[PDB]
Amino acid sequence: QVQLVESGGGVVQPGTSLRLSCAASQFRFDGYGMHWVRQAPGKGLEWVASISHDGIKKYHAEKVWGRFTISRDNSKNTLYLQMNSLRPEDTALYYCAKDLREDECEEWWSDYYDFGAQLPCAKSRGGLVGIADNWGQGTMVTVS
Amino acid sequence: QVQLQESGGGLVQPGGSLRLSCVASGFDLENYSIGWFRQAPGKAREGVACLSKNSGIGHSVKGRFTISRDGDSNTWFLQMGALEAEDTAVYTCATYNRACANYVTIWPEFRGQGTQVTVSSQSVLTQPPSVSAAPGQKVTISCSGNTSNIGNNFVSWYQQRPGRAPQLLIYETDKRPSGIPDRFSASKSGTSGTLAITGLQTGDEADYYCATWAASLSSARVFGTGTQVIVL
Amino acid sequence: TLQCTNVTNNITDDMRGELKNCSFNMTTELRDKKQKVYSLFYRLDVVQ
Amino acid sequence: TLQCTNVTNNITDDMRGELKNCSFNMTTELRDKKQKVYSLFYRLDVVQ
Ligand SMILES: *[C@@H]1O[C@H](CO)[C@@H](O[C@@H]2O[C@H](CO)[C@@H](O)[C@H](O)[C@H]2NC(C)=O)[C@H](O)[C@H]1NC(C)=O
Ligand SMILES: *[C@@H]1O[C@H](CO)[C@@H](O[C@@H]2O[C@H](CO)[C@@H](O)[C@H](O)[C@H]2NC(C)=O)[C@H](O)[C@H]1NC(C)=O
Numbered sequence: 001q002v003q004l005v006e007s008g009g010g011v012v013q014p015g016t017s018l019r020l021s022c023a024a025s026q027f028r029f030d031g032y033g034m035h036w037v038r039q040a041p042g043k044g045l046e047w048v049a050s051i052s053h054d055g056i057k058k059y060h061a062e063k064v065w066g067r068f069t070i071s072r073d074n075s076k077n078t079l080y081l082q083m084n085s086l087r088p089e090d091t092a093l094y095y096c097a098k099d100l101r102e103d104e105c106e107e108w109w110s111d112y113y114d115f116g117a118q119l120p121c122a123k124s125r126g127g128l129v130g131i132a133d134n135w136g137q138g139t140m141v142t143v144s
Numbered sequence: 145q146v147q148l149q150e151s152g153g154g155l156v157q158p159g160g161s162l163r164l165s166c167v168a169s170g171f172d173l174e175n176y177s178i179g180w181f182r183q184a185p186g187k188a189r190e191g192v193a194c195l196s197k198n199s200g201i202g203h204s205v206k207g208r209f210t211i212s213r214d215g216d217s218n219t220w221f222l223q224m225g226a227l228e229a230e231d232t233a234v235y236t237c238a239t240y241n242r243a244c245a246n247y248v249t250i251w252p253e254f255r256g257q258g259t260q261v262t263v264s265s266q267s268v269l270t271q272p273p274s275v276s277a278a279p280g281q282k283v284t285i286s287c288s289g290n291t292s293n294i295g296n297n298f299v300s301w302y303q304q305r306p307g308r309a310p311q312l313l314i315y316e317t318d319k320r321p322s323g324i325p326d327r328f329s330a331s332k333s334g335t336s337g338t339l340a341i342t343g344l345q346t347g348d349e350a351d352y353y354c355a356t357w358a359a360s361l362s363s364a365r366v367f368g369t370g371t372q373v374i375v376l
Numbered sequence: 377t378l379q380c381t382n383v384t385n386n387i388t389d390d391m392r393g394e395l396k397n398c399s400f401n402m403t404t405e406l407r408d409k410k411q412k413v414y415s416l417f418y419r420l421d422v423v424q
Numbered sequence: 425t426l427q428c429t430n431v432t433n434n435i436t437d438d439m440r441g442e443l444k445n446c447s448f449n450m451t452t453e454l455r456d457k458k459q460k461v462y463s464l465f466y467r468l469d470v471v472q
């Protein structure tokens with residue numbers, strides 16, 4: 001139910017580069033991993049790439065191996081998708097979605113001779129959980 | 145007792161793990177430590193692990209092999225992983241000095257008999273093109289793939305309405321979100337997932353997709369071709 | 377403090393309450409970090 | 425860190441200082457919350 005904004009699409013020539021931007025609000029962007037789904041008009045969905053909450057684990061597709069880049073910036077709450085070596089088959093709609101696991105904190109910073117103060121998170125477990133429940137409007141990318 | 149009894153030997157495929165173990169008694173296993181042998185044909189004797197008393201450290205000659213103990217139980221577990229063709233030999237567990245003195249080279253006393261360890265040897269989902277049934281009937285959708293994607297990993301279902309964003313309906317084949325009613329059910333068998341829809345209506349007309357997720361292998365994630373539902 | 381809650385798995389009517397499924401924060405081996413550990417505490421060892 | 429305050433009530437001028445409020449945080453029986461407590465400390469036992 002949170003808002004999803006997608007932008008950065010356009011019409012580009014083959015072999016060019018483009019950047020797609022997805023924005024997050026009303027929820028913690030750091031707490032959810034990102035995925036990119038491609039869908040040509042009139043055909044089924046196609047998974048493209050996935051990144052965890054921290055960004056350590058990056059996963060890509062056999063059709064886009066070595067040519068798609070996906071990154072996340074939690075400070076600005078933004079998702080960057082970098083395109084390399086475009087082809088005419090890439091004309092499709094790209095959908096922005098999030099995760100569901102709601103990663104928690106395994107450890108918090110402490111102060112022994114207190115132990116009662118609220119201190120920021122130290123270590124955390126999460127990521128993966130490649131299930132998408134909220135889908136944004138998406139962006140249209142045309143290659144010609 | 146003092147003699148050592150070993151267990152867990154057998155045959156392993158290259159790229160697996162074992163749980164070698166050995167137990168002993170004899171009212172004198174507080175002064176000694178327990179480690180393991182390795183003797184391959186044509187070669188001399190080496191060592192693989194030595195759980196040193198007086199330090200609790202699990203020394204080993206390679207990174208893969210690890211020795212471990214559990215409580216006061218007089219049993220020692222040698223865990224080995226990422227096995228390779230050379231690791232086929234006669235594994236014996238023996239007793240070394242109180243502080244795991246020179247091993248991988250020594251020949252101790254109070255040794256066991258020794259077990260035997262021998263080592264030797266693009267998927268796309270298939271879905272029907274479209275389905276059709278009378279309103280209020282039950283429909284079934286089959287998503288058949290491979291062992292790595294569906295057999296070894298869970299399957300998620302997605303519904304895309306015409307000119308609308310997709311929506312999650314089934315996750316790990318046995319649970320549904322709050323906004324989705326119970327009219328949809330899912331099951332898995334071997335490498336095939338089956339989705340059953342009851343009380344189909346006009347509003348359910350959409351394109352359904354099956355996907356899998358796993359970070360272990362890159363062939364594991366795969367989205368289905370899609371099934372079209374038409375209500376007469 | 378114990379953010380405890382009352383256990384209802386395969387329980388019997390005679391042993392109602394009694395066991396409590398307590399969750400509390402705890403210093404780890406480093407004396408700078410809080411875990412979140414859980415335990416079972418009988419109703420005779422916990423007070424409100 | 426004691427937050428101490430000049431005592432002033434029914435005092436015989438010359439005995440200025442000496443007695444003092446000193447209010448400070450304090451660990452209670454529970455090791456997660458701190459009680460704000462106050463006490464009276466003589467000037468010989470507190471250094472600035
Ligand atoms: C353990 O420490 C965490 C540190 O955040 C506590 O979480 C806070 O709990 C209070 C209530 O006690 C809430 O008002 C805060 O919103 C919580 N903060 C966060 C970040 O969750 C937690 O209560 C402590 N105890 C347990 C049992 O977890
Ligand atoms: C006891 O500890 C509390 C810890 O919060 C102190 O409260 C803080 O006081 C400073 C002083 O101006 C404020 O800036 C903080 O905002 C306060 N914290 C909170 C959470 O309100 C309190 O001052 C301490 N008392 C004494 C006597 O030292």
Ligand SMILES: *[C@@H]1O[C@H](CO)[C@@H](O)[C@H](O)[C@H]1NC(C)=O
Pocket residue numbers: 380381382383392393
């Ligand atoms: C657990 O069940 C007992 C049974 O009456 C009840 O009295 C107790 O309050 C319950 N615990 C909590 C935390 O509600």
Ligand SMILES: *[C@@H]1O[C@H](CO)[C@@H](O)[C@H](O)[C@H]1NC(C)=O
Pocket residue numbers: 430432440441
């Ligand atoms: C506070 O106490 C000091 C003693 O160190 C004294 O010199 C000063 O006059 C006092 N001030 C007031 C306002 O009581």
